[PDB]
Amino acid sequence: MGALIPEPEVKIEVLQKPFICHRKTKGGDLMLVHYEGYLEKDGSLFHSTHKHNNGQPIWFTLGILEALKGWDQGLKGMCVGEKRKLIIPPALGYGKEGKGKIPPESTLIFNIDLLEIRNGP
Template identity: 60%
Template structure:
């Protein structure tokens, strides 16, 4: 009985939230933490810019699943065009407004990466 009531309450709350937001659930957010910002920043990144990035990917438990630095030299760094779906959506969102030489920590939810199962295409 309690489980049924709780289940009904949760689904009713979800419907109320959808109605209050015009029928859409809010999109997942990328959490951005600037780890290092250069003293001078003449221009910030924007959609359409070509970026070269080194990256480290971690699971929630801290285990590294990928590092571009594991490969020799700069060969592991990735070139891509910001905002045109060449990379996961979390990168397109989280790397906007960045200065050359800046270092950021992005916490990307599964919906903006490869999904809950860690499979699939970037977009």
């Protein structure tokens, strides 16, 4: 019974949220983020800015399917200084194909810290 199968959806946990919030992310915003990505099955790290990007954060454009679908679903309405944990099912991650350090059908965990927001083009 297909009718009882829900659409894949990210679980969002807010790990840290500052008292201050001047601005929340919206579609087209540039987000400066640190992240750590883990495999849910064993908790092992597969990619992080800290380890795989020489300790440097990266820019991500929200809401244009620039990266994982789960990122677009999980990073809206976020303020600078906020840290979220996303549990991303494979259909919103790397799917049946997987990639590189990610096997097919992997559930993923991302801890993502928002450092800065800028206007997008």
